[PDB]
From a paper:
In an attempt to shed light on the interaction of CrcA and Crc, co-crystallization trials were performed with Crc and Strep-CrcA. However, only dimers of Strep-CrcA with the same self-complementary interface between the protomers were detected in the crystals. The crystal space group C2221 and the dimerization is similar to the Pae PhzD. Superimposition of Strep-CrcA with Pae PhzD, E. coli RutB and protein Ldon001686AAA of Leishmania donovani revealed a high structural homology for the six β-sheets and 5 α-helices (α4, α6, α7, α9, and α10). However, differences were also observed between α-helix 5 and β-strand 2 (according to the consecutive nomenclature of CrcA). CrcA and Ldon001686AAA lack a sequence that is present in PhzD and RutB. This sequence is close to the active site and was shown to be involved in substrate binding. The Asparagine and Lysine residues in the active site of PhzD, RutB and Ldon001686AAA are conserved in CrcA but not the Cysteine residue found in RutB and Ldon001686AAA, which is replaced by a Glycine in PhzD and by a Serine in CrcA. A dimer of Strep-CrcA is consistent with the findings from SEC-MALS (size-exclusion chromatography coupled to multi-angle light scattering), which provided an experimental mass of 41.60 kDa, which is close to the expected mass of 44.72 kDa (predicted mass of the monomer: 22.36 kDa). A comparison of the three dimensional structure of CrcA with predicted structural models of Pae and E.coli proteins generated by AlphaFold, using the DALI server supported these predictions by showing the strongest matches with members of the isochorismatase-like superfamily.
During CCR, the RNA chaperone Hfq and the catabolite repression control protein Crc form assemblies on target mRNAs that impede translation of proteins involved in uptake and catabolism of less preferred C sources. In vivo co-purification studies, co-immunoprecipitation and biophysical assays revealed that Crc binds to Pae strain O1 protein PA1677. Our structural studies support bioinformatics analyzes showing that PA1677 belongs to the isochorismatase-like superfamily. Ectopic expression of PA1677 resulted in de-repression of Hfq/Crc controlled target genes, while in the absence of the protein, an extended lag phase is observed during diauxic growth on a preferred and a non-preferred carbon source. This observations indicate that PA1677 acts as an antagonist of Crc that favors synthesis of proteins required to metabolize non-preferred carbon sources.
Author numbering:
A (entry chain A), C (entry chain D), D (entry chain F), E (entry chain C): 14 to 209
B (entry chain E), F (entry chain B): 13 to 209
The structure:
Amino acid sequence: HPLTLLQISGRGYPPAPLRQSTLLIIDAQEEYRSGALRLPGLDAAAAEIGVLVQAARASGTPIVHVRHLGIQGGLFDPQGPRGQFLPELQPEAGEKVVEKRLPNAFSGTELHDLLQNHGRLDLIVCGFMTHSSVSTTVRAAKDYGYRCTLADSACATRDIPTLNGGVLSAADLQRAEIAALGDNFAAIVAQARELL
Amino acid sequence: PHPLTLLQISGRGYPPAPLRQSTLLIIDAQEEYRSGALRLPGLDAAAAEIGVLVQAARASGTPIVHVRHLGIQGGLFDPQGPRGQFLPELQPEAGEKVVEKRLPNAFSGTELHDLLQNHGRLDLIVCGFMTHSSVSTTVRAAKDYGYRCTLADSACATRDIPTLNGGVLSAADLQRAEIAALGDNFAAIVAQARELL
Amino acid sequence: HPLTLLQISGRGYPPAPLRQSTLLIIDAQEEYRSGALRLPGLDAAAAEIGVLVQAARASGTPIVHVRHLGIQGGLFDPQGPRGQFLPELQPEAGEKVVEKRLPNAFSGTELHDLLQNHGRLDLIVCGFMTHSSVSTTVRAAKDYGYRCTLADSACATRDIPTLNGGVLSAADLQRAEIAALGDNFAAIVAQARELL
Amino acid sequence: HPLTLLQISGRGYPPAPLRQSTLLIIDAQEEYRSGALRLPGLDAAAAEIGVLVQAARASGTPIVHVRHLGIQGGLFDPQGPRGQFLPELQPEAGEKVVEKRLPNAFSGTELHDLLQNHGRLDLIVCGFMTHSSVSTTVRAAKDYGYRCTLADSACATRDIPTLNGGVLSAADLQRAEIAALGDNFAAIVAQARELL
Amino acid sequence: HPLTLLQISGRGYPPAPLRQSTLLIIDAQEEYRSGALRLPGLDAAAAEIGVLVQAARASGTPIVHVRHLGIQGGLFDPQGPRGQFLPELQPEAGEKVVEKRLPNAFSGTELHDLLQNHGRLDLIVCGFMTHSSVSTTVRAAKDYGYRCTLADSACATRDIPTLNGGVLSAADLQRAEIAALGDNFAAIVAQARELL
Amino acid sequence: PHPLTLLQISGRGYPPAPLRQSTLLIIDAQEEYRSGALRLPGLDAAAAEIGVLVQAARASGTPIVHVRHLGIQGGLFDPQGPRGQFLPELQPEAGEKVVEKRLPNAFSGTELHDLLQNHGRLDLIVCGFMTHSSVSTTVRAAKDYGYRCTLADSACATRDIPTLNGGVLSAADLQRAEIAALGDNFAAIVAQARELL
Ligand SMILES: N[C@@H](CCCC[NH3+])C(=O)O
């Protein structure tokens, strides 16, 4: 059984419990339910993020919400229904919203400053899509020295094209991108309840 | 049954760049991957494809930037040991700049942003190892600076990695997924190096 | 579309599967990577030989490694790095090494005795350089009544001079030398995986 | 400007004049005129062999003829016209004939004995076909320590197939095979008259 | 008193303070304490480099270290004691090290790229030996359009031979080589403290 | 009592090269040093010794490369005035190439590396002006390309230069120190031109 690079280098870390982490929810937006990027596993993932949000709000764990700012008439249009939060994952009680324009939630934003104000090294990162904004933000978090913990069940993606007319299933892309992050960028658990 | 890429959906897609109009970025073509602890199964096949790009770039005056990972003493990418050295067939020649890095992101704590800026080419052709770590991370980071990235699938390689429930993901399946991911929102992808000539 | 002499003589044979063959690897030495004969197609050909070696070791196929014995200060110097096996193609599991001093791997060597003891009439021949040690050794094998199989992609050569200060490209030399072997000395396939 | 291996090794040698050599004529047979292998350059090449044969007979240079013995109803059939020498390159009384069954004119024959008896280290090798019997016999001569000289114009060959329904022209085959022999097995000249 | 070429050409420049400069430390290595090149003035010069290093670290001035790679087991032993930094002048934090094999620390190195990345035209150059690696590196820096400042006290050299079995003292060589640099390649001060 | 050179200590020293085996490289033998603003006290003595090397080289078919400094209008080495011209006794003759340079390093922004490679001799004999600036810089640069340099002390000259605290370093003291420095790690040194004939 192959070891992770984290294990080989001695720089690995256990999955962080929610109660000692900052919860970072990435792009829980209506585009993934009724827009151009309807994710087949959205409801299952949103249910798992809700389990984390409920436990975090009950314990006073910090929650940061990332929203993608699309363009007029495009994906995640902020003037349109597709740009809004999924109703079940709206911010409450002044939980901060970070508006981003690139897959990297740190890039051109106040995210770094906000996570520093909370003072927790451990980030629990969840949301969409696993292979783009989530993976990119997790990879960028390593450069600042954060530990990232992900639950596989709390992120989701879609089918994407491969070379020569092929298709890569959402489930195969998810498995690969979660394994890649587990290799050198994060601690991975299967389910949200493992972090409670 | 045929999904679009985000680049296609956003209208921001771009053609694969010809090597002649690009800066060639080679990531971590080091001896660790041949005679170290991370012996990649597809190293030779991929190094051959990088060699095709290197040979063509040297003949055309195309800029080549070599990235070298600085690891820890006596171990992975040992800076004072054979495992840290470039593969002999992909050694830099005079004039070709080397960037030494410590993290997967070749931009992070390095002069890479500066060098690519001074070359003045928005198109990067990125190749090297490993596909899912330093390559993917560096390509994703290039998007934040406004670079266009082109990759040949055959010019990158990786290794088997563990999954949940004591599974293994094969190098081939990790490569397929990680290239497709970059094709969705971070790069133009071609099958083989000769398509960039 | 001209016929081969093997086809005209009715003496043609199918490409041998690796599982029924002795795998013969010619001069996979550092001369060709870091010495005076750096072959541009070395890595592509070493990758294809590696496919054959992995499959041979998985099935108990015998592997014979030929190593050119050069002179001090010269090509394939046995006391210098240039004489040693490429690491990814080195002998494992006590696979035998045959040292040779001429292009013909049989000349002044134990090669005939070793092949005879394996008791397999089918040889799969790969390595370097296509037009010199590989071609010569394949042609010599016909005198002993071996059948030879080659993959085009598992051999490589270099640019060589012609009359009037011309240069023959490695690709043109390879194409011609593989076609000449296919005419009267071997079964030819494009790629290593076709012998799996 | 690439060097030959003979030059890199310091083992090179100049073309031998005919007067210091043994002339070895390979398979100058009727098969190539009226049989199944009608070489497009037969007459031009047989003319150049003729130049060397005439010069040799006038100066008492030894000439050894090689004749391929095929099987009844096959290529080089000895039981009909296609096995016989071209009339213009027939042996004249005193000149010995080596009859062979393989491409290597040494294999199972008196050739080594005849060449040792003439006591000339230099062989001039000419005839048919360049890539098969000529190339194989020249390569085999190296193992005995002979120096070989060929004139490109006194050898000929035919179109042969390549992979995927391709064809290599006789001229391309001839060019590559003479260059391959020039790299490590022979000194090459363009024309017979250069050896006079 | 005679003018420098920098004054005559009006291309002169004042000594740069440490706060506006990149600090470049050349070959502060164990060779000069316990190897074949024991500089009589090493401790006094290393003390003055230490003043600059301490001040640069306290004020966020960038520091680049150059290390010379010599002979396995011998001069500037690359992975042995003699090749290591003097313990008091070891790199800290993310201070970059340039390894060189020539007196010119720019030649085939990343130095130009690292200095350009720091964005400061003014270099303070110190270390060993004044007349060889220091002088060569300062001269080379003129071709890239850098301005160099040297403190005489923060460089050292050794006695060297002249013609006729003569000896040039470290003190005379230092005076001459620092003045040569002042003439066309640098701004000179007596002591490290004048740059604080 | 007698210290060793760094070249002796490293085992990579070489003897002085005879003129007959060398390319002769003559640096900035120009009228500025005779009738301009930089009148060298030792110019005539040095020019006599360079003349000996030029005469022997011309006699024996030894290649000669002339380096000339290109100054600015109205400045030192003005190419538009007499001060930028060659000293009459050291003018180039038919087929001897001239390299025009803007910096002390004669290789920098010039075709000097190309010309020297075209003559195919590893041994340069370097002479001319000034010892401590263009000569010293050019000899130091030569090491980076793998050349061996030979100098005659008598075939170079410099001038008095200021030191710290209003002091003066004499032309002779500067010469002795800069020739010794080149002998330490950059060159084989002889006393006079006739030792190379
Ligand atoms: N006789 C071989 C020819 C291979 C040519 C490769 N250059 C075949 O039929 O496959």
